[PDB]
Amino acid sequence: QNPMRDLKIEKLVLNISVGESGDRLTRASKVLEQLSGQTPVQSKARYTVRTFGIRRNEKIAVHVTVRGPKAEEILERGLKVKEYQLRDRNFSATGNFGFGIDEHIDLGIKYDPSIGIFGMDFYVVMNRPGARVTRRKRCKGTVGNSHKTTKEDTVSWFKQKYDADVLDK
Amino acid sequence: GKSHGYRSRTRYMFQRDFRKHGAVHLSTYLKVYKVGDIVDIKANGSIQKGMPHKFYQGKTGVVYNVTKSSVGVIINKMVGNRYLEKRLNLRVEHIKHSKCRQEFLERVKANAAKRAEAKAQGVAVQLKRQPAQPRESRIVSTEGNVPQTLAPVPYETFI
Amino acid sequence: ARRPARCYRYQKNKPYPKSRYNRAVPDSKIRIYDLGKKKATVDEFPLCVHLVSNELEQLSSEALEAARICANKYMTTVSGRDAFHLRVRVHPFHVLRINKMLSCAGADRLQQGMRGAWGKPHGLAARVDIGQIIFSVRTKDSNKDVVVEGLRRARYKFPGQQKIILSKKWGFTNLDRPEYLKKREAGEVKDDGAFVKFLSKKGSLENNIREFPEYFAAQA
Amino acid sequence: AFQKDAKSSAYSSRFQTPFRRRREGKTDYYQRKRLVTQHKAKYNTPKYRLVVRFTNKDIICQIISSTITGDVVLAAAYSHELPRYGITHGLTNWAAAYATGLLIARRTLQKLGLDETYKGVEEVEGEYELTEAVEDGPRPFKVFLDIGLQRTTTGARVFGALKGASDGGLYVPHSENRFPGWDFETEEIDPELLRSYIFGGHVSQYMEELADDDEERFSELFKGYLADDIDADSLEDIYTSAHEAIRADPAFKPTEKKFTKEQYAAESKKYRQTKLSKEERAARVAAKIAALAGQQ
RNA sequence: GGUUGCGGCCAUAUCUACCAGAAAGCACCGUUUCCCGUCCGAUCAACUGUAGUUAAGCUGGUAAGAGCCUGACCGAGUAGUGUAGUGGGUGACCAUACGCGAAACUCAGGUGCUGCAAUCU
RNA sequence: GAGAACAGAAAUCUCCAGUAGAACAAAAGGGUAAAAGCCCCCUUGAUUUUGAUUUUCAGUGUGAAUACAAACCAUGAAAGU
RNA sequence: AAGCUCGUAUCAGUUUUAUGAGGUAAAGCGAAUGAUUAGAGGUUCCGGGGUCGAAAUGACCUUGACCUAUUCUCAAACUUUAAAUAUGUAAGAAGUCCUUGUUACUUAAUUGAACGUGGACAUUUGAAUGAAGAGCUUUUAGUGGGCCAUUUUUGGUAAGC
RNA sequence: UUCCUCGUGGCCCAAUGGUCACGGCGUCUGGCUACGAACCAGAAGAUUCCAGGUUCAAGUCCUGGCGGGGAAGCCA
Known about the structure:
This is part of a larger assembly, with chains A, B, C and D. By secondary structure, chain A is α+β, with helices and mostly antiparallel strands. Chain A is built from 4 helices and 5 strands. In chain A, strands 2-3-1-5-4 form a 5-stranded antiparallel beta sheet, covered by helices on one side. Chain D has helices at residues 9-13, 20-24, 29-36, 94-112, 157-168, 191-198, 201-213, 215-220, 223-227, 234-248, 261-271, 278-292, and strands spanning 49-55, 58-65, 72-78, 144-146, 182-183, 188-189. Chain C: One of its GO terms (molecular function) is structural constituent of ribosome.
């Protein structure tokens, strides 16, 4: 009973939350640019804390979205790092997952000492076909419960490909 | 110390009729107002332009002018020992026709029809409105509906 | 300090409660409103004796506390702590004011008399109507003569006239005594903490059964 | 599948529903008011709007006025009717939008009586121009574009239909800054590019480009053209002949209905579900109480 | 009768959980040369009805469903109120006379109707 | 609420719910959800002329506001504002 | 006070019929905002304190909030609801209907809007009761310290306040 | 009772709304001294009287309470 109730990768978000702005953040932008092939986007701070040393609208972090074959490619080459081993958490109740890595030279990227070393947060968000019903302008609707993405279904999918597992409880 | 502004004492007046907020329906805007037409004034708090003063809430006037978005209404306001003629310029969101006049005009058509019918079939029009008259001599019947006798009841607390 | 209660007996002013406009009020003397075997199933105590006002007036927090204490002590002395559930079915929310003129020698250090006479909070009072229930008890049917005397002794600590009526209906609930017995035998009742939940004919049948397995079960 | 949500009785009690068309997601009443509200000093002059809508596999252009009872249609034109003018394939494209605009224009103008005058552009070269008013004669029919919830972008087929209606004879007020060929850095329209977008220049150019870049695609797409013996350069002639036929006779011959209304209704009622009654509900409840807790 | 576009009244139309949907139409769906817009062809834009599906949306049905609507000698002629008295009462307040008259509670029923145009085994 | 390395009660990213429980310079009240709010684009109608009307009211003044007229402009595909 | 124009016109400190508006009293708060009494059941890795534990998204108790269903009592500056009294308009001759003219306004349009010609409908001519006349103008005096009673109501313990 | 003012490390005192806060004394450590003071070097010590709100940020800005001090209380 899966003609079109199949589970595909909606998108993969690569996030790098540098604590503050400057050449560090330009180097992170170069990282994500040379990684994906897209131009990243620099995200600002909402409010001020000072225990972290940030103030409003300081351009604190960067991120980029990837969709399709490029996304699954980046996923597998960055999940070989995690050894195809993930937790039973790291999986949301909405059928999405994610994992953080350090030292992104683990993914086939040469050092380029002008750039340095940066960690990353991968977050993969899923959807069945027919997600346009929520994201479109006209006749914007909601998705049926039979069609929703679940932790269980996402886990079964993540097992039935990559031949991976759900270690750590 | 005191406060006597335009929208003073207008909390509940221009409050917005529970579960009927926002987005006034368009029959409001498609209605048609000719000169010499009777209109009741009922403000809308969602439309702040063209409002009436609170005095004219619930008042009823006659149209004297019609414009792009508004109509002009003649009201009569009591000031001392005279009535003064007041001319408001109100947007149509704050306005609606009078079913009273609509009913009177229906009654006019009916009176004309009855008069023509009586001219055709026999005079004795008799087409005024009389008040509720006293009721004539009826005869009830018992027929199973026997009189059920009642009595007062004593004091009980049931607390 | 604390001028008498004849100055504040009657409902002369509108209700003036503690709010964002009237802050800075004192705290009520009465804080305990339910005492006795409060953790008692409804089947333990069928009787009930209400203390009911016949006058429209105000009652001080002070008087409510005094009456509570007198009643409770008579109960605990005669029948024990676990023979009654006294409930105070009226709450002091109405704030009473003083203007507080000077009494030492108010000739020159005047307070300007009735100028700026709006008063500061003096105390609290409960606003009471005719027929309004005060001081319910819910005992067993064998402690009637004890609770009636307790309430009669409490009745001296209130102004007005406060009569004592012997109620029906398992008196912290509604539902007259035979009707409650019909429901209790037909299994239309679940015992919540100190009070009952009833079976209706409106809800979803799944949860109605999973809350009331008994009602139409052929076993019972 | 999540019961932490739990819309409570209070929420449901003081929830205000939007208008039905807003719940659906089909009408912006802000736009509707500011498009339908008429100058009250005209008193019954209907404000005519050209509603252009794009489903998948169909364009819908219809002329509409408003009333307290409901909107009222003066004329309508659909793209599934273009086959009688000689357009079988690509009938949701920019060119079919142009043709549908021309069709609804000439259809209205015919049934209204103005078609002899205000014949619009019969020498289409993609030039910005509005239907001027004939002195010593009536004024042109005025009608305002209702897009709806569609986004305004330059190069779009709502504006193709608008261009077609304006060239067909209706006075459709518009600027030229959302047609294709609008140079952005310097504000000037490109009529040769616009004429290509009318006569399928971008479609035919893509076909030619796939005829030497990749033919597998060209085969899976564009299959109807290969079936119907169509190459790239026939497309301009096709659309030109179609425009000429539309200007010749737009009078809307409808279809034959082939097992008509009552047959249709019976066939539909065969599969539609009737509701229930109170006796049936009580019976269902009785059975459910005898089943669930009865345990046989 | 179903569906689409545009609507009127704006929950008898919403919400929660399940079950069906023939034909047609919507819809999801396929692609990125051009117009166009994005961190991203997801949205928006354009091109194909071609590669496929009714899974979802949508439509309807069910639920001693929540909510909403209607009605009633259900509460209740109750509370409250206009008018009256050299009426009762220390008073607080109360009754009576001539009138008007609720809300909650209870019970029962219902759960979108409809206009213009077009199309459909 | 559920999730993602450093990252924790609060940093940035993703999803679900969310009739407003937020924001709209400032009192309080009203009003507002494909908005009147947040972001972006373009702008100066915060222009000109001189009258009428509403409020306060003596039916005077001032202030404030309303709806039109003749122009000139902005914005928008446009209706319109 | 002077009068003027007219002689049932149109009016009225009133009702009725129709149609509006209102947010006080009452009522409600197992309905939003707030205040508020008491128990019941769940919830934590995601509060703290104890027993067993070298530790363990380790086993069990204590209180803490949080959630669900219930329960008692309230609101001048809260409210779904919502009176009585009081209040607006109308009840037609300056009316209704039919034909058709003027325009620089308006319309896609001799379509509308406004004003008209001509014609038809009168003595139940369009509810009640009354009308010691109706309408209009001029000029001028004194007054511009108020007080009491019923009822509504603010301050104040209250007051012949 | 009205008004004015102040509340800061054990003590005294200051602060631009812009670093979980300057000085001086006391305390502590070490060193000079046979020893203690004095001196030389260095350290620790703060929930800015309490409760709220404004602002990105309050010691500071706004309201109330608590304590200390001061002025006022006249005509008869």
